[PDB]
Enzyme design. Sequence first.
Site: not given
Lengths: 152, 9
Positions: A64, A96-102
Amino acid sequence: PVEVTYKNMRFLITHNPTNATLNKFIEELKKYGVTTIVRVCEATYDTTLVEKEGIHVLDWPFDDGAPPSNQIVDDWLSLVKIKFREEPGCCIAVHCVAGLGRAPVLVALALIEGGMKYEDAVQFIRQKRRGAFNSKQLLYLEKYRPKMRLRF
Amino acid sequence: SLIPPKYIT
């Protein structure tokens, strides 16, 4: 989970589904016409059940706050022009892994490579996701010059 | 015996 369209394109940013909902996720995803899902962050689950249900999962990450290679943009750009002309009305999910991220960054590129200025794409996106494109990302998109080989 | 394979590059 949110969605954005433009011309023949319709994307759907989502949240890294836990193994605890994978079964439901698939059901959601299929209710959108999602046929492909690009994972640009850490992979936290099996794909056999998914792939079981005609839904390929491409895994092209990148840190990210870091420009997505040069390869990744190609494939993305190709994938986007192809899949859409090839499967009229289908959706493509990026998560993404977290949320929106990249994830937005890509979609953006998809929009930029489609005759939209970067701000035109940032706005078009922040319309669905309140806050996205942290200072760094806003720079990447800003500097980014398109190849522009997208026919419509 | 399943994990997440697929993908390409």
